[PDB]
Each structure stands twice: as C-alpha cells, then as structure tokens.
Amino acid sequence: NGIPVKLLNEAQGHIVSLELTTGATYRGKLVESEDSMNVQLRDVIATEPQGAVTHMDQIFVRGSQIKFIVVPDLLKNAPLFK
Amino acid sequence: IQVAHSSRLANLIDYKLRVLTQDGRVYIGQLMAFDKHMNLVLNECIEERVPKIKVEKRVLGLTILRGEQILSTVVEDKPL
Amino acid sequence: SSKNEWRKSAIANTLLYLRLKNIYVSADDFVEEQNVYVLPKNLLKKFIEISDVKIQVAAFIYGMSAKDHPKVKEIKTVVLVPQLGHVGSVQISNIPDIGDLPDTEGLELLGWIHTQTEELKFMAASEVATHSKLFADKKRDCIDISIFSTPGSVSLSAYNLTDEGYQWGEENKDIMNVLSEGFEPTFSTHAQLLLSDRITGNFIIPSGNVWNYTFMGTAFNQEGDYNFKYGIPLEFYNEMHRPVHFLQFSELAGD
Amino acid sequence: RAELEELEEFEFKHGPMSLINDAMVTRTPVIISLRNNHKIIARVKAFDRHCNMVLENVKELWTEKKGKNVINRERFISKLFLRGDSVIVVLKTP
Amino acid sequence: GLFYFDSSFRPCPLSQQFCGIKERNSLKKLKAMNDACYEKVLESINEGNQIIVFVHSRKETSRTATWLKNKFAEENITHKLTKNDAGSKQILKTEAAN
Amino acid sequence: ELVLYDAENDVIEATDLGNIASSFYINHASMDVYNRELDEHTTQIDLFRIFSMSEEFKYVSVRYEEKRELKQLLEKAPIPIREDIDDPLAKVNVLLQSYFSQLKFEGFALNSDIVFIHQNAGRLLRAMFEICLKRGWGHPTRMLLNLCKSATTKMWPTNCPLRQFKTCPVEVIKRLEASTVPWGDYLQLETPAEVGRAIRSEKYGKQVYDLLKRFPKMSVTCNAQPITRSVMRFNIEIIADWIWDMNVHGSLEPFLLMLEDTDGDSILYYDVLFITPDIVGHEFTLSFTYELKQHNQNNLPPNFFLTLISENWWHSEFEIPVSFNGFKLPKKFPPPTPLLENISISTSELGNDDFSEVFEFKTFNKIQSQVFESLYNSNDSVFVGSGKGTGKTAMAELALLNHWRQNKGRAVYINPSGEKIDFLLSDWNKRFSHLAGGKIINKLGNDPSLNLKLLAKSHVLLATPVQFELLSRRWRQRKNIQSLELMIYDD
Amino acid sequence: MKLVNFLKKLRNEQVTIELKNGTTVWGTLQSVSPQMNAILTDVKLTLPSDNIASLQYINIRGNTIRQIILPDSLNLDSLLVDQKQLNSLRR
RNA sequence: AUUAUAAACCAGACCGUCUCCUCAUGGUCAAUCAAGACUAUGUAGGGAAUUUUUGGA
Structure with a gap:
C-alpha cells in the first residue's frame, strides 16, 4: 500500500500541523486517519494568512484540498519501513 | 548541482529535493516515501515565499506532502 | 588409481572408428538348418563408435525375418538402452517396451549385443547371467553378439544359449566364479551371423537420450520403466553422460 | 476485457468526438481553445479518448498586455501534444 | 595533399640518449643494465622526473621493479615517498590494498 | 579449395570455403588446417584441439607463472585433452573450457590470454561449424553447433538452460543442475505447482513455468514423399509451441534444420529457417527435395533424421525419425518418344483450303509434324505433352479444325490460365468463326447459369477447368455436356 | 488505443x-x-x-503539462490490434 | 635456466530490445471461526467524473 497513508495512521495521537490551499495553517492533535487523507483534530490553533488568529476546540479537514501535513521527527527510520 | 543520470523515483529515494507547488511556494526536503500520487514525505520542510523580485523563508515542519497541488521535483544536494 | 583410467579411455576412444578398418572372423561353415543373422557394417560401426575400449557397452538388437528366407534374421534396429558398464561386466535395464514408436511393425526382439576385451569361444559369468536375467522365459532362442575389440580389429562373436544356462543365471548372477567354471565353455552354442552393407539399420535410444548411466549411478533402475525414441545414440564418454565432471570444473578447478 | 473497452471505439464516431474524428481523417483547420485568454489553430492528425490530441502546422494567437492593451503575439509550432483537459471547444471549418 | 613534418615540429622534442654496455655475458650483462638504469633513474628523480621504463617481457617487469625496490632501500627510500602523506597516504591506502 | 582456377584458360571463381574464410576473417593457413583436421569422424575432444590449433594462436605460448593454474585445471578440466601441460595447444583448450564454464582468474596473465579467446572463440567455432555444414558432416556439426551455442552463452551442455534467461534466480538453477533429471522432463511438465514441487523450490514455481512456456520447443513432424527415383520431397510440419518475448527470443528465432542419415554421420540437406513471432503456434510447413546416392537409391534406409536445432536455445535440438518403412521408389524414369526426320507435313496436306488461311505460315514445326497424322487425320484420342515454346496452341487449333471437319462442333478448350484463355479467345473468334460458317466461340464467365446458357448456344467454349468442372457436375440433367465431343485439355 | x-x-x-x-x-x-x-x-x-533559475534534474507530475513539442518529427502509431490477433493460434 | 602486443564471425527494419500505479491470475507464505506481504503473467483498467494524474484560470 501507500506508505504515507500508513505513516499518517501510525502518527494518530501526535501534535500534527497543517497547510491548506489558501494557507490557513493549523497545529493540533491527530484524531483519525483514512485512505483518502481525511483528518480530525483537538485543541486546534487557527493561524491564518489574514492575521486574525484564533483558538478552536475541534476541526475536521477535507483531504483533497490539502497542500501538505506536518509530522514530528520520531517516526523517521522505524517502525513503518521494515 | 551534483546529480547524475538517475533513471527513476525509486533510484533517487532519500535525496534532498526542491519541490514546487501550484501557488509558487518553493520547498526543500529529503525524499522519504514514494507514492501513486507523489505524496512524497520530506525529512524536513523549509518553504519559501515571493510577493505579487525576492525570496523569503519558513521552517515549521517535517512533512507528509500531498500530490494534488505539486508541479515537479528537483534534486538540490545528495546526503552522506 | 581410479581417475587415471576413464579420461585416458575417453582420449583413446577417438581411435574406435579405426577398429573397423580391419574386421575379421575365423568363419565357421554355414548351415540352413538353423537361423542365420544379418548385421549391417553401419549399425555395428556406430555401436563401436559409441563403445569404450575397456568396458562392456551393450544394447539390445531388433528386427525380423525377410520373406526371401523365413530362416534369416535381418537386424534392422539396435535398441540402445540404459546401462551402467563395469570393466568386463554390465548392469542393464529391462527388455525395452517399444511398440510406441513408428517402424515397429511386428519387430521381434531378436536379441542383444555387447563389447568386451577377451576373444573367447564362449560366454562368461558377467555375460551369461545377464543374458539369463534379460530373457528368462521371455525368449529362449534369442541370441547374443559379443564384439571382441582390440586396436586394429573388432571381430564379431555371435552366441546362442541353452535352457540349462538360464537356470544357472537365476542363481549365480551374484558372485560365483567357480560356478561358471563348473558350467563350462558350454553352453555358448556358436550361432550364425553375417555382415553386410546390402542392408542398413538404425538405433532406438532412450527418450532421455542418455543410455550410459556411469556417473548417473543414483538414477539407474535395473527393473525400471524408460521411454525410447528413435535417435542418434551417444558416445560412451559424451558430455551428456558425464555431467558431474563439468559441475566439478564449474565449482572452480582453479581455486 | 476486450469487448468492454473496444466497443467504445465506435463511440468516437457516434458521440460528440465524431466531428473531430472526421477532421482527423480528412485533415482540416480548427479553432483550438484554452484556459487563460488563448486562441490556437491547426490541422488534425492523431486522435485519442480524452482530447490528448496531436495536430500539424500550428499557430498560437495570444496576448501579453502590461497596461490595458492587446498585443496578439504569433509563433509557428509543429507536432505538439496538448493535454486534453486544457482543450474546451474545437470545430471543423470549411 | 602530402604533409611530411619531422621531430623539428614536435610538442616535446625527443632528447635522445644511449647506454653502450661494454660487457657480454648475460648474468653480468643484466646486472650492468640494472646498474645503468639505477644511475639514470637516480639522476632523473632528483629533478622531479616521473619516469617510464619498458623491458621485453611480463616476467621481467616485476623482477626489475623488485630489484629497484631493493636498491633505493639501501641509499634513499625518502625521495620516492617524499611528501608528508596525511591525505596522500590515505589515497595510497584506498587504491593499493583493494 | 578456397577458389577455382585454370592456369591457361584463366577463369576465377569463389568456393563456399573461400566465402567462409572471407566472412570469418580466417588466415588462409587456419582454414587449411581446419579443412584437413575437421574430418567425418572427428570428435568433441578433437574439436577443442582443432580450435586450439587455429593459427590465430601461433604466438600463444605456455608460461611458468600460468603453469600452476593450468596444472590445477588440466586434471579437472572436463574436455579430455591429448596434449600435455607445456604444449600451448593444451593451454588454449583448457582456457576455452574455462570460458565455457565461466572461470575468471586470479593470475591475470591467463585472464588476459582468455580475454583473447572470449573475443575470438565464438568466431572460430562458428566458422568450424559452417565448414562442417558445407562438408555435410553430422558428428562435428551438431557437436559444433553445441560448442557455438556454449561460446555464445557461456555455459556447458550439462548447465541447465534456464541459466540463459536473464530473469531466473540462482537458487533454482543450482537445484536444477544437481538433480540429474532429463531437462526435457521439466519442459514437458504442465502445472506450475508441479514445477515448484519438482524444482526443489515451491517458491518461484509459477515464475519458472512462465519461463518454460517461455522456452523454444516444437512438436515437429515430417513425412517425405519420393517425387521420382532420385528425388525426394520432404514435407515438414513445424509447430512452434513456445510463447514469444521481445526481450528474450529476439527479433527472430533461427533454427538450423538438418536432414541427416540413419547413422547421423552425414548431412543430406540442410537449411536455416527463421521462426518469427508471427510463425509461432501456426502449424507451418517447410519442404525440400533431396536427390540420392546410387547405392542409397538401390537399397534405401529405415530412416533419416530431420533435426531442428536452435542457433541459441540450449538442448533445443528436436530430432525426429523421417519414416521410410517400405518407401518403394519408382521405376527408372520411362523414356521420351523419338523425333524422326519428316517435317514435310504442311498447310498443303489439310483437306479444304479454308483451314489453310488461319496459320500465318506454310509448313509446321518439328514436333507439330510428328503428331499431325494422329492429330488431324484420325478422329481418336491424343496426348501430345510438350513443349514450352513449341505450339501446343497450334496443335489445339488443328484438333479443333479436325473436329469441325466431321461436323461435330461441341469444343471445349481447357487451359487453366484465364488471362491467356482470354487472349486465345480474342485471337480465335477473329480467325475462326468466319471460316466455319459461324461457329460460336465463348470464354466462360463466372456464374453458372450464364455458363450453361453459353454451352447451350456456343460451339466452342473455353473454360478454366474449375468453371467447366462446375458446369459439368450436374451432367445427368444438363444434357448439353452429355453431348460434348472433343475436349482440348490444355496444360 | x-x-x-x-x-x-x-x-x-x-x-x-x-x-x-x-x-x-x-x-x-x-x-x-x-x-x-x-x-x-x-x-x-x-x-x-x-531568467535561468539554475536547476538541472526534474521529474514531472503528469498533471502539469500543456504542450510537449520537438522531440522527433515522425508519424508511427498502432500496437494492440496486432497483438490480440496473432495470439489466436490454438483454441 | 624462463619469450614482446594485438584486431577480428554470425539474426536488424515488413517488427512495440523497456515501464509507475490499482484489479484479477495461479504458486507461495505469515496467519484465524473466511481475511494480509511477495515473486510472476499483461489476458484487465487508469475523464471510477467529488479524496489527488485531466481543470478553478
């Protein structure tokens, strides 16, 4: 299967940041991962390009409209590869 | 830049690649995981901005990329 | 000294065509009252070409009586069959089942043939016992051709066999060098054979292609089923019977 | 396997492509459209499923106007491969 | 179409030379030759001359080289290794042992 | 025998051996050596020796620093050798063997030497093979072919052929080798599971199977038919049972077909044939004619062997017994009739002088004459036969005239060649319907009704045997053809 | 196709x-x-x-392309219509 | 005692020397009461219209 998906799944319960089409970045917990890259978060920070930053409780994001997703450095070599 | 006649994506895995997106925001990062969509996980992210001249910098993450809005991938400087 | 022989023989084996430049028999007088046998200088030559200098190589032979004289036996077909040859003795496979092939129209099992290196006027234990084993009650009247071979000359020594011999054979196949003595030169009844090129003939050879199982010792099965194609029979030390040597060489002979 | 896709071969000649198939068969000039203010002309040669097309003797016609104007730039192109998503309207002219 | 040109026009003109060995017998003659080679070689390498030698055969080569090795070892091993070899030695290690 | 030459007449020509020499850049000396040393009764042992003797090895000598390696080898080296260590020939032969078996070396002098062999073995061997073929000598040429193959693909005969695919794995090949199974058996096996079971590796079984239906293999059949006493057609039927692959099998798959004798000593006739992708699977024929030897003609064998072998695929070599049981040849070609000197027969002798005005000459041809009396005067059957050039046409015309003479009419000229039939019709209707008093000449068309109508009407019909045959068949009802009277079966 | x-x-x-x-x-x-x-x-x-932005080795995502031009000026096309048919050898 | 270096045949233009992904295929393994990673076939498909590669410039 696709390894990035697997990696994402593995990192369920990590402080994952985000960046969308518009550039509305985020940084909260990873709640769940799927084959299509649909994500849900907790205690999520909203830091948009507009400037008006806010603090939100939960948020769910569409996978298709993602540019990329941030991950910590722990799952780098192991255990996902071999 | 020092990069040879590399035939395919699997033969150039784990290289420090420039990556390009739809809006124009340029990247740099070490290639980790090939994919169907080219959702290429980078070892470290440093995205760069140009206003609508001159290039800026960021450093937030070490990212799982998503392929939809990518343009193409270019080698910068190999490891080891 | 076990390596010195085979290689030498193989090298020697190049001089086997020459062994039929000269061919002669101390010709015994002819008798219509028995069946007289017709062998072709072609088939014989081929057999000699295959043979070893030292060793018993030994096919079956086949054919049938022509309508000219129903006493005659035309030897149209060698049937080179699986075997493991010793020096002056030979293991051999079954009477070959060969109704599968074409040109097997009512071909009687006429007998068999072999090489050796001693011009007797009779059949030895090595031979006689083997013969018995081959043709216990399957065909009593079937005959043997020894071909004595020596540098310069091969000579054909045809032999028949009596029913007392077969009985001996069943018991004394294993060992028994005094039993053969007891039995004697008799009963190797000298049978009538002719050599010709007014006919020619062919081999049946194992469908495998590799009748000599010298170095395929593990494969051989004295009472085993084998297929048989029409084919060009191979030389005794032909690269297909010798596989192990090649393998050894590959497993570098220059370490 | 073989029947399920190859039946769509005649679907070119019946469906809305039929025109462009015909054009391809008997090479004729056609207006070729694009996303960002573009106009292109050429004769048809090789034809596909999804408008990923090839042509010959091609003329691009487009503008780079830095200040409320029109500058119809023109350059000859030959033996291209336009990705069919970009194509919008094509039509056979007499 | 013809264009003869001599050593006159050579990039590095051939400064020719000869030895002229007086001795005859092979077992001494060879020795003499070796000595001559050494003497020439010594003269050369002092001036920073990286040198080629030919011989006749393959078997001759190694024996000549060996002899040479067991000639300069007496007088001066220094002037063929010369350099301090912190990187040079590494380089040598990399290719000589493989 | 590289050329043909006459000292005084001064006429040069190139032989096959000369050609061989040219192509395979032989030094004439080498060629000469080959010519004598290759021999009806040469053997594998000899063949290597002969190769060694090749005079692009005049300068190769044994060397002390090599010697040890040679010693190590020459014991275990699997071609027996006639020479002994110091001889350079022996060394060469052992190097060849090494190359065949892939024995890359430590003491590189040998390796340098072996490099030469590698670049030039396949050449020399091929040349030798060609020479053998030319000669017509089975023993070497099959062996020589094998040798050539080995040279090409660096492995021996006993090294299992899979080896020569790029994609099969190392463990499998080893397993195959030791196991001492007749390779063909593996090929024969049907199920990939079965293959797996019997490749000491249930892993990769499917892969190997795929790589056995990727291997060349032909259930060839061939019956010959004796054209005449000397001549023998041989109808071959070659099936190509394997599945092609443009990486593996190449642009085409050559197969040097031999026909060879009951012994396997002599080639009779040979041919290269390229099996192409296109061919494979199609039951595809191939024919050739072979004359015979006087003795052979007299007393003939129980068989020959027709024998495809690939110019690549190890242990391909499909040999089959060209059945001959009771191939009772014909009686020595019956004799042609004699031409007597009596050409006096001419446009005079024919009765009414109307018929004289049709021929654009006066006196007939030599052969035309010899038959005329039987042809024109008498009303009985005629076989002419020959000859091409000479007027069959004239004879036909004469016959027609004769038929007309007795008031018969119903003529049927049957040549096959319709495009010449048409021509005949064109230059008959103009030269003939006039002079009879209206005798109607018609070339038959295609469709049967029309033809029937023509028959009913027309006096002379011309027809392609096909068409006229079609017309006739229902003759018990179509009573026009019941009442046909003369038939000029042309050709 | x-x-x-x-x-x-x-x-x-x-x-x-x-x-x-x-x-x-x-x-x-x-x-x-x-x-x-x-x-x-x-x-x-x-x-x-x-302006030359100084890159050497690219690998394209196939979405990006508008027009490819000037590798070779040829016209050779079909393949699958040949292969389907010549495999129908035996039933 | 003991020998320089060096080039080489043959099948090819009427012809797809060579694929990143998913699905099936039989042969395997790693396994729990009916499911996952590997070689291998190309015989399948890739505007599955929206979660990517065929249109939000």
Missing part, C-alpha cells in the same frame, strides 16, 4: 515542454508513465530570455 501510448515509445528525446502555468524547459524525456509522468535529466528554467 491511447495517445499516451504514443509517448510511451519515445525513449530519450529533447523537449521544451509548455506547462500549464507557462514554462520553457529543454530536457531528455527518458520513460513516460501511463499517467504522463516523464523524467527529465537536464533542464533550463523560468520561474513566475526568461
């Missing part, structure tokens, strides 16, 4: 691909994918003559 099968054959040819956002990039095609992913060894650039 498909016109991506056209570019499947063309191994190692020089092209200056017009991408959708607008670019000029001289490079060797190598092997193209059935999703139009080509692999480009040597490159010249234009970021949004046009």
Whole structure:
C-alpha cells in the first residue's frame, strides 16, 4: 500500500500541523486517519494568512484540498519501513 | 548541482529535493516515501515565499506532502 | 588409481572408428538348418563408435525375418538402452517396451549385443547371467553378439544359449566364479551371423537420450520403466553422460 | 476485457468526438481553445479518448498586455501534444 | 595533399640518449643494465622526473621493479615517498590494498 | 579449395570455403588446417584441439607463472585433452573450457590470454561449424553447433538452460543442475505447482513455468514423399509451441534444420529457417527435395533424421525419425518418344483450303509434324505433352479444325490460365468463326447459369477447368455436356 | 488505443515542454508513465530570455503539462490490434 | 635456466530490445471461526467524473 497513508495512521495521537490551499495553517492533535487523507483534530490553533488568529476546540479537514501535513521527527527510520 | 543520470523515483529515494507547488511556494526536503500520487514525505520542510523580485523563508515542519497541488521535483544536494 | 583410467579411455576412444578398418572372423561353415543373422557394417560401426575400449557397452538388437528366407534374421534396429558398464561386466535395464514408436511393425526382439576385451569361444559369468536375467522365459532362442575389440580389429562373436544356462543365471548372477567354471565353455552354442552393407539399420535410444548411466549411478533402475525414441545414440564418454565432471570444473578447478 | 473497452471505439464516431474524428481523417483547420485568454489553430492528425490530441502546422494567437492593451503575439509550432483537459471547444471549418 | 613534418615540429622534442654496455655475458650483462638504469633513474628523480621504463617481457617487469625496490632501500627510500602523506597516504591506502 | 582456377584458360571463381574464410576473417593457413583436421569422424575432444590449433594462436605460448593454474585445471578440466601441460595447444583448450564454464582468474596473465579467446572463440567455432555444414558432416556439426551455442552463452551442455534467461534466480538453477533429471522432463511438465514441487523450490514455481512456456520447443513432424527415383520431397510440419518475448527470443528465432542419415554421420540437406513471432503456434510447413546416392537409391534406409536445432536455445535440438518403412521408389524414369526426320507435313496436306488461311505460315514445326497424322487425320484420342515454346496452341487449333471437319462442333478448350484463355479467345473468334460458317466461340464467365446458357448456344467454349468442372457436375440433367465431343485439355 | 501510448515509445528525446502555468524547459524525456509522468535529466528554467533559475534534474507530475513539442518529427502509431490477433493460434 | 602486443564471425527494419500505479491470475507464505506481504503473467483498467494524474484560470 501507500506508505504515507500508513505513516499518517501510525502518527494518530501526535501534535500534527497543517497547510491548506489558501494557507490557513493549523497545529493540533491527530484524531483519525483514512485512505483518502481525511483528518480530525483537538485543541486546534487557527493561524491564518489574514492575521486574525484564533483558538478552536475541534476541526475536521477535507483531504483533497490539502497542500501538505506536518509530522514530528520520531517516526523517521522505524517502525513503518521494515 | 551534483546529480547524475538517475533513471527513476525509486533510484533517487532519500535525496534532498526542491519541490514546487501550484501557488509558487518553493520547498526543500529529503525524499522519504514514494507514492501513486507523489505524496512524497520530506525529512524536513523549509518553504519559501515571493510577493505579487525576492525570496523569503519558513521552517515549521517535517512533512507528509500531498500530490494534488505539486508541479515537479528537483534534486538540490545528495546526503552522506 | 581410479581417475587415471576413464579420461585416458575417453582420449583413446577417438581411435574406435579405426577398429573397423580391419574386421575379421575365423568363419565357421554355414548351415540352413538353423537361423542365420544379418548385421549391417553401419549399425555395428556406430555401436563401436559409441563403445569404450575397456568396458562392456551393450544394447539390445531388433528386427525380423525377410520373406526371401523365413530362416534369416535381418537386424534392422539396435535398441540402445540404459546401462551402467563395469570393466568386463554390465548392469542393464529391462527388455525395452517399444511398440510406441513408428517402424515397429511386428519387430521381434531378436536379441542383444555387447563389447568386451577377451576373444573367447564362449560366454562368461558377467555375460551369461545377464543374458539369463534379460530373457528368462521371455525368449529362449534369442541370441547374443559379443564384439571382441582390440586396436586394429573388432571381430564379431555371435552366441546362442541353452535352457540349462538360464537356470544357472537365476542363481549365480551374484558372485560365483567357480560356478561358471563348473558350467563350462558350454553352453555358448556358436550361432550364425553375417555382415553386410546390402542392408542398413538404425538405433532406438532412450527418450532421455542418455543410455550410459556411469556417473548417473543414483538414477539407474535395473527393473525400471524408460521411454525410447528413435535417435542418434551417444558416445560412451559424451558430455551428456558425464555431467558431474563439468559441475566439478564449474565449482572452480582453479581455486 | 476486450469487448468492454473496444466497443467504445465506435463511440468516437457516434458521440460528440465524431466531428473531430472526421477532421482527423480528412485533415482540416480548427479553432483550438484554452484556459487563460488563448486562441490556437491547426490541422488534425492523431486522435485519442480524452482530447490528448496531436495536430500539424500550428499557430498560437495570444496576448501579453502590461497596461490595458492587446498585443496578439504569433509563433509557428509543429507536432505538439496538448493535454486534453486544457482543450474546451474545437470545430471543423470549411 | 602530402604533409611530411619531422621531430623539428614536435610538442616535446625527443632528447635522445644511449647506454653502450661494454660487457657480454648475460648474468653480468643484466646486472650492468640494472646498474645503468639505477644511475639514470637516480639522476632523473632528483629533478622531479616521473619516469617510464619498458623491458621485453611480463616476467621481467616485476623482477626489475623488485630489484629497484631493493636498491633505493639501501641509499634513499625518502625521495620516492617524499611528501608528508596525511591525505596522500590515505589515497595510497584506498587504491593499493583493494 | 578456397577458389577455382585454370592456369591457361584463366577463369576465377569463389568456393563456399573461400566465402567462409572471407566472412570469418580466417588466415588462409587456419582454414587449411581446419579443412584437413575437421574430418567425418572427428570428435568433441578433437574439436577443442582443432580450435586450439587455429593459427590465430601461433604466438600463444605456455608460461611458468600460468603453469600452476593450468596444472590445477588440466586434471579437472572436463574436455579430455591429448596434449600435455607445456604444449600451448593444451593451454588454449583448457582456457576455452574455462570460458565455457565461466572461470575468471586470479593470475591475470591467463585472464588476459582468455580475454583473447572470449573475443575470438565464438568466431572460430562458428566458422568450424559452417565448414562442417558445407562438408555435410553430422558428428562435428551438431557437436559444433553445441560448442557455438556454449561460446555464445557461456555455459556447458550439462548447465541447465534456464541459466540463459536473464530473469531466473540462482537458487533454482543450482537445484536444477544437481538433480540429474532429463531437462526435457521439466519442459514437458504442465502445472506450475508441479514445477515448484519438482524444482526443489515451491517458491518461484509459477515464475519458472512462465519461463518454460517461455522456452523454444516444437512438436515437429515430417513425412517425405519420393517425387521420382532420385528425388525426394520432404514435407515438414513445424509447430512452434513456445510463447514469444521481445526481450528474450529476439527479433527472430533461427533454427538450423538438418536432414541427416540413419547413422547421423552425414548431412543430406540442410537449411536455416527463421521462426518469427508471427510463425509461432501456426502449424507451418517447410519442404525440400533431396536427390540420392546410387547405392542409397538401390537399397534405401529405415530412416533419416530431420533435426531442428536452435542457433541459441540450449538442448533445443528436436530430432525426429523421417519414416521410410517400405518407401518403394519408382521405376527408372520411362523414356521420351523419338523425333524422326519428316517435317514435310504442311498447310498443303489439310483437306479444304479454308483451314489453310488461319496459320500465318506454310509448313509446321518439328514436333507439330510428328503428331499431325494422329492429330488431324484420325478422329481418336491424343496426348501430345510438350513443349514450352513449341505450339501446343497450334496443335489445339488443328484438333479443333479436325473436329469441325466431321461436323461435330461441341469444343471445349481447357487451359487453366484465364488471362491467356482470354487472349486465345480474342485471337480465335477473329480467325475462326468466319471460316466455319459461324461457329460460336465463348470464354466462360463466372456464374453458372450464364455458363450453361453459353454451352447451350456456343460451339466452342473455353473454360478454366474449375468453371467447366462446375458446369459439368450436374451432367445427368444438363444434357448439353452429355453431348460434348472433343475436349482440348490444355496444360 | 491511447495517445499516451504514443509517448510511451519515445525513449530519450529533447523537449521544451509548455506547462500549464507557462514554462520553457529543454530536457531528455527518458520513460513516460501511463499517467504522463516523464523524467527529465537536464533542464533550463523560468520561474513566475526568461531568467535561468539554475536547476538541472526534474521529474514531472503528469498533471502539469500543456504542450510537449520537438522531440522527433515522425508519424508511427498502432500496437494492440496486432497483438490480440496473432495470439489466436490454438483454441 | 624462463619469450614482446594485438584486431577480428554470425539474426536488424515488413517488427512495440523497456515501464509507475490499482484489479484479477495461479504458486507461495505469515496467519484465524473466511481475511494480509511477495515473486510472476499483461489476458484487465487508469475523464471510477467529488479524496489527488485531466481543470478553478
């Protein structure tokens, strides 16, 4: 299967940041991962390009409209590869 | 830049690649995981901005990329 | 000294065509009252070409009586069959089942043939016992051709066999060098054979292609089923019977 | 396997492509459209499923106007491969 | 179409030379030759001359080289290794042992 | 025998051996050596020796620093050798063997030497093979072919052929080798599971199977038919049972077909044939004619062997017994009739002088004459036969005239060649319907009704045997053809 | 069938691909994918003559391309209509 | 005692020397009461219209 998906799944319960089409970045917990890259978060920070930053409780994001997703450095070599 | 006649994506895995997106925001990062969509996980992210001249910098993450809005991938400087 | 022989023989084996430049028999007088046998200088030559200098190589032979004289036996077909040859003795496979092939129209099992290196006027234990084993009650009247071979000359020594011999054979196949003595030169009844090129003939050879199982010792099965194609029979030390040597060489002979 | 896709071969000649198939068969000039203010002309040669097309003797016609104007730039192109998503309207002219 | 040109026009003109060995017998003659080679070689390498030698055969080569090795070892091993070899030695290690 | 030459007449020509020499850049000396040393009764042992003797090895000598390696080898080296260590020939032969078996070396002098062999073995061997073929000598040429193959693909005969695919794995090949199974058996096996079971590796079984239906293999059949006493057609039927692959099998798959004798000593006739992708699977024929030897003609064998072998695929070599049981040849070609000197027969002798005005000459041809009396005067059957050039046409015309003479009419000229039939019709209707008093000449068309109508009407019909045959068949009802009277079966 | 099968054959040819956002990039095609992913060894650039932004080795996502031009000027096409038929040998 | 270096035949233009992904295929393994990673076939498909590669410039 696709390894990035697997990696994402593995990192369920990590402080994952985000960046969308518009550039509305985020940084909260990873709640769940799927084959299509649909994500849900907790205690999520909203830091948009507009400037008006806010603090939100939960948020769910569409996978298709993602540019990329941030991950910590722990799952780098192991255990996902071999 | 020092990069040879590399035939395919699997033969150039784990290289420090420039990556390009739809809006124009340029990247740099070490290639980790090939994919169907080219959702290429980078070892470290440093995205760069140009206003609508001159290039800026960021450093937030070490990212799982998503392929939809990518343009193409270019080698910068190999490891080891 | 076990390596010195085979290689030498193989090298020697190049001089086997020459062994039929000269061919002669101390010709015994002819008798219509028995069946007289017709062998072709072609088939014989081929057999000699295959043979070893030292060793018993030994096919079956086949054919049938022509309508000219129903006493005659035309030897149209060698049937080179699986075997493991010793020096002056030979293991051999079954009477070959060969109704599968074409040109097997009512071909009687006429007998068999072999090489050796001693011009007797009779059949030895090595031979006689083997013969018995081959043709216990399957065909009593079937005959043997020894071909004595020596540098310069091969000579054909045809032999028949009596029913007392077969009985001996069943018991004394294993060992028994005094039993053969007891039995004697008799009963190797000298049978009538002719050599010709007014006919020619062919081999049946194992469908495998590799009748000599010298170095395929593990494969051989004295009472085993084998297929048989029409084919060009191979030389005794032909690269297909010798596989192990090649393998050894590959497993570098220059370490 | 073989029947399920190859039946769509005649679907070119019946469906809305039929025109462009015909054009391809008997090479004729056609207006070729694009996303960002573009106009292109050429004769048809090789034809596909999804408008990923090839042509010959091609003329691009487009503008780079830095200040409320029109500058119809023109350059000859030959033996291209336009990705069919970009194509919008094509039509056979007499 | 013809264009003869001599050593006159050579990039590095051939400064020719000869030895002229007086001795005859092979077992001494060879020795003499070796000595001559050494003497020439010594003269050369002092001036920073990286040198080629030919011989006749393959078997001759190694024996000549060996002899040479067991000639300069007496007088001066220094002037063929010369350099301090912190990187040079590494380089040598990399290719000589493989 | 590289050329043909006459000292005084001064006429040069190139032989096959000369050609061989040219192509395979032989030094004439080498060629000469080959010519004598290759021999009806040469053997594998000899063949290597002969190769060694090749005079692009005049300068190769044994060397002390090599010697040890040679010693190590020459014991275990699997071609027996006639020479002994110091001889350079022996060394060469052992190097060849090494190359065949892939024995890359430590003491590189040998390796340098072996490099030469590698670049030039396949050449020399091929040349030798060609020479053998030319000669017509089975023993070497099959062996020589094998040798050539080995040279090409660096492995021996006993090294299992899979080896020569790029994609099969190392463990499998080893397993195959030791196991001492007749390779063909593996090929024969049907199920990939079965293959797996019997490749000491249930892993990769499917892969190997795929790589056995990727291997060349032909259930060839061939019956010959004796054209005449000397001549023998041989109808071959070659099936190509394997599945092609443009990486593996190449642009085409050559197969040097031999026909060879009951012994396997002599080639009779040979041919290269390229099996192409296109061919494979199609039951595809191939024919050739072979004359015979006087003795052979007299007393003939129980068989020959027709024998495809690939110019690549190890242990391909499909040999089959060209059945001959009771191939009772014909009686020595019956004799042609004699031409007597009596050409006096001419446009005079024919009765009414109307018929004289049709021929654009006066006196007939030599052969035309010899038959005329039987042809024109008498009303009985005629076989002419020959000859091409000479007027069959004239004879036909004469016959027609004769038929007309007795008031018969119903003529049927049957040549096959319709495009010449048409021509005949064109230059008959103009030269003939006039002079009879209206005798109607018609070339038959295609469709049967029309033809029937023509028959009913027309006096002379011309027809392609096909068409006229079609017309006739229902003759018990179509009573026009019941009442046909003369038939000029042309050709 | 498909016109991506056209570019499947063309191994190692020089092209200056017009991408959708607008670019000029001289490079060797190598092997193209059935999703139009080509692999480009040597490159010249234009970021949004046009200025050389100093990159060498690109690998294309097949979505990006508008027009490919100037590898070779030929017309050779079909393949699958041959292969389906010559495999019908025995039933 | 003991020998320089060096080039080489043959099948090819009427012809797809060579694929990144998913699905099936039989042969395997790693396994729990009916499911996952590997070689291998190309015989399948890739505007599955929206979660990517065929249109939000």
